[PDB]
From a paper:
To strengthen this hypothesis, four mutations were inserted at position 76: [name], D76E, D76H, and D76K. While D76K resulted too unstable to be purified, the other three variants were structurally and biophysically characterized. The crystal structures of [name], D76E, and D76H were determined to high resolution. Analogously to the structure of D76N2, these structures do not show any major conformational change compared to wt β2m. However, although the backbone of the EF loop is well superimposable between the structures of wt β2m and the mutants, changing the residue in position 76 alters the H-bond network within the loop, in particular in [name] and D76E. In keeping with this observation, the [name] structure where Ala76 side chain cannot establish any H-bond with neighboring residues, displays an electron density for the EF loop poorer than those of all other structures indicating an increased disorder. The side chain of Arg97 presents different conformations, and the strength of its interactions with the EF loop and to Trp95 varies in different mutants; residue Met99 interacts with Ser11 or with Arg12. Such observations suggest a role for residue 76 in determining the interactions within the EF loop and with β2m C-terminal region. Similarly to the [name] mutant, all three mutants display a decreased stability and increased aggregation propensity, confirming the key role played by position 76 in determining β2m biophysical properties. A saturation site mutagenesis (D76 to E, H, and A) allowed us to show here how position 76 is indeed crucial in the β2m fold, any mutation at this position results in a notable decrease in thermal stability and a remarkable increase in aggregation propensity as observed for [name]. Intriguingly, the crystal structures suggest that D76 is an important node in a network of H-bond within the EF loop.
A recent case of systemic amyloidosis involves the highly unstable [name] mutation of beta-2 microglobulin (β2m). The [name] mutant is strongly amyloidogenic and, in contrast to the wt protein, aggregates efficiently and abundantly without seeding and under native conditions. Indeed, the 76 position is located in a solvent exposed loop between β-strands E and F. A detailed analysis of the interaction energies of the ensembles reveals that D76 is at the center of a network of stabilizing electrostatic interactions that are lost in the [name] mutant.
Numbering used by the authors: 0 to 99
Write the structure that this text describes.
């Protein structure tokens, strides 16, 4: 058996084919086993519609999730990524930095 803690990155991107739109991303990488819970939060509340959830795995057994959705942020709300996994004794909450 092997278990590996997920790396968690939270960042924003504009797709080049539609640059006025902005997307909040959570890249959860390198984890094992694949069982996992991942949500985007706004002011601490789950974002219910997340348009994209893409899972893959590498040669060593090691899973990768890109979890993302269109959003329109502004100086007001706080956004974060919440992850729970067997390797994490508490849910990990990673805040979105608006410069990322």
């Amino acid at each position: 058996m092997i278990q590996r803690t997920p790396k968690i990155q939270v960042y924003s991107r504009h797709p080049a084919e539609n640059g006025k739109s902005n997307f909040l991303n959570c890249y959860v990488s390198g984890f094992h086993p694949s069982d996992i819970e991942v949500d985007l939060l706004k002011n601490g509340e789950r974002i219910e519609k997340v348009e994209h959830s893409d899972l893959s795995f590498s040669k060593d057994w090691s899973f990768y999730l890109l979890y993302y959705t269109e959003f329109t942020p502004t100086e007001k709300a706080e956004y974060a990524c919440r992850v729970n996994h067997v390797t994490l004794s508490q849910p990990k909450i990673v805040k979105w930095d608006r410069d990322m």
